[PDB]
């Protein structure tokens, strides 16, 4: 139940987890519904993530990587200003070590396929297919929108496009990178990344 309770990823996770828990219940004192920490899920399906060479990788490839989703728009001037800074942070931060440190997945708020692909040609990190519903599920899960189109359920718009969200293995909001938030640090909030403390395990 993190960051929220009313999100499609959370409700699907709850359905699958307590379906499995009930199944083991009549197969066998067990606790119903299961505790959120006991609950486990697959955050990205088999054919979701795609790299710069258009080859799919599974979720197990993100292990040991401080991974962050990047909600972005091709035509948005904040995203156009932010993208070289995020690019150079990824570049330098990954170059300067004997180990992979940070990794970025790209979630698109862009209007259509051609502009999404033209935007994706500039990003050197992983991305999610636009017609994959996982983008909409992640947008509703982490409460990001340009404008109120999908109804939030008494919750808030946690961030506007663009945003960088450090995530966990179970969809936990590990930390917020305050590019457009109540703190408003444009292009230098990226340095608040505690990549030592947060790793995709």
């Amino acid at each position: 139940s993190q960051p929220v309770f009313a999100s499609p990823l959370n409700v699907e996770k709850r359905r699958l987890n307590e379906e499995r828990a009930l199944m083991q219940a009549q197969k066998a004192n067990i606790q119903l519904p299961p505790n959120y920490g006991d609950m486990d899920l697959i955050l990205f399906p088999e054919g979701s993530l795609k790299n710069s060479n258009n080859t799919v990788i599974p979720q197990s490839h993100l292990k040991g990587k401080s991974v962050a989703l990047y909600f972005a728009d091709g035509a948005d001037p904040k995203c156009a200003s932010l993208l070289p800074f995020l690019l150079n942070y990824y570049r330098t931060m990954n170059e300067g070590g004997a180990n992979q440190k940070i990794e970025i997945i790209f979630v698109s708020l862009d209007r259509d396929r051609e502009a999404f692909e033209s935007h994706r040609a500039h990003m050197p990190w992983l991305s999610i297919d636009l017609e994959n519903p996982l983008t909409e599920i992640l947008k509703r899960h982490f409460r990001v929108m340009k404008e109120y189109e999908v109804p939030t359920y008494g919750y808030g718009s946690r961030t506007g496009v663009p945003s960088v969200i450090v995530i966990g293995s179970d969809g936990r909001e590990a930390q917020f990178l305050p590019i457009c938030s109540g703190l408003e640090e444009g292009d230098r909030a990226l340095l608040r990344w505690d990549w030592r403390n947060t790793k995709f395990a």
């Binding site: 109120y148 008494g154 919750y155 808030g156 718009s157 109540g182």
Partner: protein, 48 residues
Amino acid sequence: PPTLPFHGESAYRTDYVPKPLPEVAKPVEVKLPPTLPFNAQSCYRSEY
């Protein structure tokens, strides 16, 4: 007009999550030195 939905989470709501408990299991295992066996071997049996 839409309603700007309230994003907000206080200090008391944000900045601590339940930590894992510290892993402590270590006593002070001291190997006892064996009592050094005693011959300040006494007078009667010692000389006569």
